[PDB]
């Protein structure tokens, strides 16, 4: 089996306290306390989720550069959608998410560029015909203790996103739930040859998942990138002393309506 599969099994065998220490070991973490305390209480620029910080991390390093019409698949509360709205060359943001019981509904915010954001709930993207976009974002992937179940879920997401990518967005950022399973690596290699990009591990991701982002501004060997992530994750297991996370300031999303080019 792959190193990721080994990681997965060891993760599944962990105790409660061990698991909770491990998931944040040596990760980058946003101080969400201030943002999430404003949940029960929209112009303060506080992001709706920790997802915003992940997208900033990628954009800040030019792994993706949102432009024109942005489509955000599985937008949830809208962390990525509202971040995209603050990008210089973005003109429109369209978010889709399933919502309903047990799932996130879009949160209407008045952060900067809110006037160009529309998010629609009650949309299962596996039945949604594709549309033209300039930037395609997708953050879909339900975790499972089974790598085989995650593999199938990941292949289904990849089949679905291929339709959107064939519409010509040059900028994209797609969550790969289970990048380490053989069938997923195979599909990624064909899609990389077809659409470009590469896989990046965002250090804000918890050690409890192996998610990697397929992004347009990356390049290089997928197998190697996945393997190095597996080894780093396994390397953080069973430490003698837990050092904990490293903290960074949350994203500032500003306020009010925006002009677009
Ligand atoms: N088949 C499907 N169709 C539409 N949305 C789905 C879906 N399966 C899962 N989702 C949604 O996809 C979301 C992924 S989490 C999205 C986080 C977002 N990037 C942010 O920054 O806030 C979840 O809210 C989940 O409800
Ligand atoms: Cl899924
Ligand atoms: Cl702000
Ligand atoms: Cl403006």
Curated annotation (Swiss-Prot):
It comes from Murray valley encephalitis virus (strain MVE-1-51). The record marks 8, 11-12, 14, 19, 23, 143, 206, 208 as: mRNA cap binding. S-adenosyl-L-methionine binds at residues 49, 79-80, 97-98, 124-125, 140, 213. The record marks 139 as: Essential for 2'-O-methyltransferase and N-7 methyltransferase activity. Homodimer. Interacts with host STAT2; this interaction inhibits the phosphorylation of the latter, and, when all viral proteins are present (polyprotein), targets STAT2 for degradation. Interacts with serine protease NS3. Replicates the viral (+) and (-) RNA genome, and performs the capping of genomes in the cytoplasm. Besides its role in RNA genome replication, also prevents the establishment of cellular antiviral state by blocking the interferon-alpha/beta (IFN-alpha/beta) signaling pathway. Inhibits host TYK2 and STAT2 phosphorylation, thereby preventing activation of JAK-STAT signaling pathway. The record marks 54, 175, 211 as: Essential for 2'-O-methyltransferase activity. Phosphorylated on serines residues. This phosphorylation may trigger NS5 nuclear localization. It is found in: Host endoplasmic reticulum membrane; Host nucleus. The active site is at residues 54, 139, 175, 211. It is a peripheral membrane protein. The chain holds residues 2535 to 2797 of 3434 of the full protein. Residues 1-259 form the mRNA cap 0-1 NS5-type MT domain. The modification Phosphoserine is found at residue 49. This is RNA-directed RNA polymerase NS5. It comes from the Viruses.
């Amino acid at each position: 089996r792959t190193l990721g599969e080994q990681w997965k099994e060891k993760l599944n065998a962990m105790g409660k306290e061990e698991f909770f220490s491990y998931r944040k070991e040596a990760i980058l973490e946003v101080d969400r306390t201030e943002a999430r305390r404003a949940r029960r209480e929209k112009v303060g620029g506080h992001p709706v989720s920790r997802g915003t910080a992940k997208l900033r991390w990628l954009v800040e390093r030019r792994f993706v550069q949102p432009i024109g019409k942005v489509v955000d698949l599985g937008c949830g509360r809208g962390g990525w959608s509202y971040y995209a709205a603050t990008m210089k060359n973005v003109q429109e943001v369209r978010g889709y998410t399933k919502g309903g019981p047990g799932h996130e509904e879009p949160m209407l915010m008045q952060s900067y560029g809110w006037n160009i954001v529309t998010m629609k709930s009650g949309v299962d993207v596996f039945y949604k015909p594709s549309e033209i976009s300039d930037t395609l974002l997708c953050d879909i992937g339900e975790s499972s203790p089974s790598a085989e179940i995650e593999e199938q879920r990941t292949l289904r997401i990849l089949e679905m996103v291929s339709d959107w990518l064939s519409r010509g967005p040059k900028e994209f950022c797609i969550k790969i739930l289970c990048p380490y399973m053989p069938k997923v690596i195979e599909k990624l290699e064909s899609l990389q040859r077809r659409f470009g990009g590469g896989l990046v591990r965002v250090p804000l991701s918890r050690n409890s998942n192996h998610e990697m982002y397929w992004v347009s501004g990356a390049s290089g060997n997928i197998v190697h990138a996945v393997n190095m992530t597996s080894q780093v994750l396994i390397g953080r297991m069973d430490k003698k002393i837990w050092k904990g996370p490293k903290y960074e300031e949350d994203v500032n999303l500003g306020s009010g309506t925006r002009a677009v080019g």
